[PDB]
């Protein structure tokens, strides 16, 4: 007989069982081969989507910049994605957005941003995703990249005393006119050293953007790679991102700065709002909108103009600090990647080629490669491709969504001329209302007209629509009911991986939070518990006392068991059975077991004088791998270790250093010295320490002050 699982979708409603369409139970995709193909293909797609043959030579680069907004070389295929933005009409959407909500809407939103940013310590820039370190020309965790960035400035032109985003940015802009810059670059000789560079190279290195072959993306055959910008570009990006965040927050129709459980209701409100809004004649209908090549269409060129429109009234001191972020993307450089390989029909000899040396091999490559390559030779450089108009993905999600909402925000007085809904970055939901069924077509049509007018391109293949009851948004499918799916939060359930006590109690609270928000049923969560437990026990190599299983950690338990009376009240880490449950998920195991623990046990386990929601009896550091230390990366880290021992030292002097950020108009050393003197005096005067020893301390302090002064 013929087993068909889809047949169960016949009688029942799909929205309840949609979580069985998605295969989140298994692993995600992975990158194989070269990422250059995709990069190139995408660059060609950018320029192609930029429907404009207008090309002007740059005064500074001696390279043809293709600047393309307003100017439109229309193609017959209009329905196919476009990148040309009609700024005139954009600023119309900006105006009729503002006049829809208040009159100082932008002024205020900016004020808030100015306020938050002006405050900000540049160190907070270390918080975020990985970014391009241009010192070693590699991708790094923002912190270390910034460390190098700054350290280089320090070694070039003397230590940086800004302590603020503004002065950081001012220094950033000051470095472009620097004809020369010095680096911390590692060169091994059969060691770390000081390499030079010129303005001409440096400028390019700054505007450089790196390619990441995608990992962690769910639901695609081919790899949509992600871009991770430079350290000099980032701040200005953050500035705009925050302005756009401030704008987003206030918008009802925005689904971006507000997520998870909130988003859910934003829809429920606006649904019933519209259903109430309806006339007897008027007819409502919904569409699920997904957009394709969202980022490739949008253009920093437009964003510059929009930012200039927003900052119009706010301040001539921050306007110039808003206009800076886009121009670095209007003049951005894109790293090509790993490269191409050559092979004979022998499987014997291979020839690796760099991105630099592509233009050497010319006609040697296959034709597909050639056809994609030849046009890009215009915009090529030694290691990198120059492109203005394409927006790199992931950086301006906020401002993207802003622009999105700007479309939905409202137009021409017609019968049944209504559309509105939600939008998060690319994804958008559109509810359209019109008097008669035939007009709905026209009204919808006009919307995509206005979206594609400014480079919002609805995916004609992926999008679909119906009566209001059925629609999807970011893996959230609607009806009368409200999307029961656990598919979203599946890999989070498993052991987090810090420490035994922390892991399980976290895992629990996770199961809880999920059970509330994602609306999973209880037996589900019980199973989840029993699983997370088993995988915990496996991950930490522990098992129950009553379990027959023998092992290293278990062998002790065989002498342990006989002493303790209440064997059930034992912790899991020490071989105890499960005591927690669905009801007790809020409660950490330690607490729930605590009362029923054996007096010897509880006192012996938790004792603070030890070799050892967050629970404290077990807290340990995981040893770093012997991988980063073997390469040249350590020769660089030689700096980072000089930051460590100092911080570890200061923390030994001031106990509240980690908890309360140290403040006051003093140097670190000056405070250290005086504090040491104070403690020395305190211990001498009344406590149990000798005088000559105190004088010996004083001597060490002053002898330190000399060596401190000499520098």
């Amino acid at each position: 007989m013929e087993i068909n699982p889809y047949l169960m979708f016949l009688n029942n409603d799909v929205t309840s069982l949609i979580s069985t369409t998605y295969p989140y139970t298994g692993p995600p995709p992975m990158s194989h081969g070269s990422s250059t193909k995709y990069t190139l293909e995408t660059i060609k797609r950018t320029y192609d989507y930029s429907r404009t043959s207008v090309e002007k030579t740059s005064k500074v680069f001696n390279i043809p910049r293709r600047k393309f907004c307003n100017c439109l070389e229309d193609k017959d295929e209009l329905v196919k994605p476009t990148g040309n933005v009609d700024i005139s009409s954009l600023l119309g959407l900006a105006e009729m957005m503002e006049k829809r909500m208040g009159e100082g809407f932008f002024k205020h939103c900016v004020m808030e941003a100015e306020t938050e940013i002006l405050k900000m310590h540049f160190s907070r820039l270390t918080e975020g995703r990985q970014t391009y370190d241009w010192t070693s020309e590699r991708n790094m965790p923002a912190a270390t990249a910034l460390q190098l960035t700054v350290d280089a400035i320090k070694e070039t032109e003397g230590p940086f005393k800004g302590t603020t985003m503004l002065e950081y940015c001012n220094k950033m802009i000051e470095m472009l006119d620097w004809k020369e810059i010095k680096f911390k670059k590692v060169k091994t000789v059969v060691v770390m050293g000081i390499d030079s560079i010129k303005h001409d190279e440096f400028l390019i290195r700054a505007l450089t953007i790196n390619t990441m072959a995608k990992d962690g993306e769910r639901g695609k055959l081919q790899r949509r790679a992600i871009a991770t910008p430079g350290m000099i570009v980032r701040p200005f990006s953050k500035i705009v991102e925050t302005v756009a965040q401030k704008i987003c927050e206030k918008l009802k129709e925005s689904g971006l700065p507000v997520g998870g459980n909130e988003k859910k209701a934003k829809l429920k409100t606006t649904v019933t709002s519209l259903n109430a809004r309806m006339n007897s004649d008027q007819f409502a209908v919904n569409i699920t909108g997904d957009n394709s090549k969202w980022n490739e269409c949008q253009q920093p060129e437009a964003y510059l103009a929009l930012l200039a429109y927003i900052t119009k009234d706010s301040s001539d001191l921050m306007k110039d600090l808003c206009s800076v972020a886009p121009v670095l993307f209007c003049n951005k450089f894109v790293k090509l990647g790993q490269g191409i390989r050559l092979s004979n029909k022998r499987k014997t000899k291979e020839v690796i080629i760099k991105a630099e040396k592509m233009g050497k091999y010319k006609n040697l490559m296959r034709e597909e490669y050639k056809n994609l390559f030849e046009p890009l030779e215009k915009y090529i450089q030694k290691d990198v491709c120059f492109l203005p108009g394409g927006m790199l993905m992931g950086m301006f999600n906020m401002l993207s969504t802003v622009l999105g909402v700007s479309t939905l925000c409202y137009e021409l007085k017609a019968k049944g001329c209504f559309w509105t809904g939600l939008q998060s970055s690319d994804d958008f939901v559109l509810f359209a209302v019109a008097s008669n069924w035939s007009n709905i077509h026209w009204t919808i049509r006009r919307f995509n007209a206005v979206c594609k007018l400014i480079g919002i391109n609805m995916s004609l293949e992926k999008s679909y629509g119906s009566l209001p009851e059925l629609f999807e948004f970011t893996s959230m499918f609607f009806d009368g009911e409200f999307v029961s799916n656990l598919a979203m939060e599946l890999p989070a359930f498993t052991t987090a991986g810090v420490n035994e006590g922390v892991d399980f109690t976290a895992a629990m609270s996770i199961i809880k939070t999920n059970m509330i928000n994602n609306s999973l049923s209880p037996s589900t969560a019980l199973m989840a518990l029993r699983i997370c437990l088993q995988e915990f026990r496996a991950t930490y190599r522990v098992h129950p006392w009553d379990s027959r299983v023998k092992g290293g950690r278990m062998k002790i338990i065989n002498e342990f068991i006989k002493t303790i009376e209440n064997k059930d009240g034992l912790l899991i880490a020490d071989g105890g059975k499960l005591m927690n449950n669905i009801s007790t998920l809020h409660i950490p195991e330690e607490v729930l077991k605590f009362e029923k623990m054996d007096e010897q046990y509880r006192n012996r386990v938790f004792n603070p004088k030890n070799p050892f929601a967050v629970v404290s009896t077990h807290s340990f550091r995981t040893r770093a791998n012997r991988t980063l230390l073997n390469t040249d990366m350590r020769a660089m880290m030689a700096e980072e270790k000089r930051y460590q021992m100092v911080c570890d030292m200061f923390k030994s002097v001031f106990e509240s250093a980690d908890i309360n950020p140290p403040i006051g108009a003093m140097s670190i050393g000056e405070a250290i010295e005086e504090k040491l003197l104070e403690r020395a005096k305190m211990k001498r005067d009344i406590g149990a320490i000798e005088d000559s020893e105190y004088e010996e301390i004083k001597d060490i302090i002053r002898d330190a002050k000399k060596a401190r002064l000499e520098s």
Binding site: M8, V79, K360, R366, V450, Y464, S466, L520, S521
Partner: protein, 502 residues
């Protein structure tokens, strides 16, 4: 800045002026109507394209067995486990060899084989290793066996002369995967993974917590029943072996990197006996599927070599990657006869990621669970009564087709289906499938659109079906699900006509 501006204006100041002094009049209506004429945007209807040209499917050779282990045909070897002997898990085989295992040896002349002599040799090196210590003592055979290759590199700098003088035949090419056609076996595989095995429970599940009467009773009860159903299944078996073995490799990767190790393919199970008599015990044990070989190479992907026992005749159409031998004969019996033994051999690639996610196969239970439970609650919540127990036994789910007739089973046995489906989703996960589902949803939504008479529409269905087609390459599951979605579309079209049948 002064040359980053979009407009005909070159200086920033002028762009600034046009921005600051902007007041937009309603000409955007005309701009939008002109945009509309130029658009020719497709005002699509569902009744017109309701066909969706059924679903396109690739033609060629029948798709092969992508799963790292064989399921249906795979054979077991039973061993009654000691807590202190079995604890090692690595010694399991060492204690197996003292049994019959040592006797089995294949002939040099194999059925359907690709590289006989290598595998035959290796087998002997495994068997030889097991006696002394479960590590293959080879420096050179390892490098070949990994290869079955390296490609020596040449600097660009010196290459300039060999471009000017073209020698070694210099060229550049990249390759694509060959498309395959819909599998037949897969159905039988599913039908086997559904039914209950004689052995009781595979996946090690932890204890149950203390419970309050109000919720814990319900949860504990539901869990005990569901686990009780799904532990007996063959699907669970394979989960068990996956977990236990991939776990064993995951250790070995830390234990002995850059080394060649013999790792078993085993699963743990306890046999349950409810004849109503006081038996010695329910039998506590572990059973073996075959032997596996580690080879660390390339950080990156590990290369793995699988050897499985089987009692069934091989099929060239699906086992094309597999290399088969005639091993000998094994004894099988029952009472209210010894059959020839075949040894299946292959080589595969395992990413650390794949090791990680395939080692945690338990997850599949949960995604089923939610899906199962929710139905019972949604049902029971209407009548405001405890309809869980009733719903589970009385609610009928459409499971398959037989003799041209639509069949349905109770949710407790049509649960197994979901579990299998979710397990296959774990095993057969290729970027193909990912895309397949993530474009498939749109079909389902359009379908349920037609169900409740919502008069749907899809803008470029040819384009959708092209993206669906595009992601259908060589993925047995991915294809299976397509072909099944066809039959769905068909039977749905038969119930309520907003679709096509060829």
């Amino acid at each position: 800045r002064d040359e980053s501006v979009p407009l005909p204006f070159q200086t920033y100041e002028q762009m600034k002026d046009y921005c600051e002094k902007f007041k937009g009049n309603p000409r955007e209506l005309a701009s939008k109507v002109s945009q509309m004429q130029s658009n020719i945007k497709l005002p699509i209807k569902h009744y017109e394209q309701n066909k969706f040209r059924q679903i396109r499917l690739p033609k060629g050779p029948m798709a092969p067995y992508t799963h790292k282990f064989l399921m249906e045909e795979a054979w077991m070897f039973t061993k009654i486990s000691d807590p202190e002997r079995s604890r090692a898990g690595e010694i399991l085989i060492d204690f197996f060899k003292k049994g019959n295992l040592s006797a089995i040896r294949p002939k040099d002349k194999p059925l359907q084989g690709k590289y006989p002599i290598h595998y035959k040799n290796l087998w002997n090196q495994i068997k030889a290793a097991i006696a002394d210590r479960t590590m293959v003592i080879n420096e050179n055979d390892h490098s070949e066996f990994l290869g079955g290759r390296a490609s020596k590199k040449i600097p660009e700098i010196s290459l300039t002369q060999d471009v000017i003088t073209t020698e070694g035949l210099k060229q550049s090419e990249n390759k694509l995967p060959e498309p395959r056609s819909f599998p037949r076996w897969f159905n039988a595989e599913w039908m086997w993974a559904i039914k209950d095995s004689d052995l009781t429970g595979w996946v090690p599940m932890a204890e149950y917590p203390p419970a309050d009467n109000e919720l814990e009773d319900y949860a504990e009860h539901l869990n005990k029943t569901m686990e009780g159903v799904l532990q007996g299944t063959n699907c669970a078996r394979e989960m068990g072996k996956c977990i236990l073995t991939v776990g064993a490799l995951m250790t070995e990767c830390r234990l002995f990197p850059g080394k060649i190790k013999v790792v078993p393919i085993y699963a743990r199970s306890k046999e349950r006996k409810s004849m109503q008599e006081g038996l010695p015990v329910p039998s506590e044990m572990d059973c073996l599927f075959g032997i596996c070989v580690k080879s660390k190479s390339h950080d990156g992907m590990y290369t793995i070599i699988t050897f499985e026992f089987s009692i069934r005749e091989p099929n060239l159409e699906k086992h094309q990657k597999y290399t088969v031998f005639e091993a000998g004969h094994t004894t099988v019996r029952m009472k209210k006869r010894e059959v020839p033994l075949y040894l299946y051999c292959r080589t595969t690639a395992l990413s650390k990621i794949k090791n990680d996610w395939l080692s945690k196969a338990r997850r599949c239970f949960i995604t089923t669970m939610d899906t199962v439970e929710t139905i019972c609650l949604r049902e029971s919540a209407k009548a405001e009564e405890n309809l869980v127990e009733k719903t589970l036994n009385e609610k009928q789910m459409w499971i398959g087709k037989k003799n041209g007739e639509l069949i349905a089973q109770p949710l407790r046995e049509a649960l197994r289906v979901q579990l299998v489906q979710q397990f296959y989703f774990c095993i057969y996960n290729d970027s193909q499938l990912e895309g397949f589902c993530n474009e498939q949803k749109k079909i389902l939504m359009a379908l349920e659109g037609d169900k409740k008479n919502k008069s749907s529409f899809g803008f470029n269905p040819e384009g959708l079906l092209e993206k669906i087609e595009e992601c259908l390459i060589n993925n047995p599951m991915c294809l299976f699900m397509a072909q099944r979605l066809n039959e769905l579309v068909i039977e749905a079209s038969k119930r309520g006509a907003k679709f096509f049948k060829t």
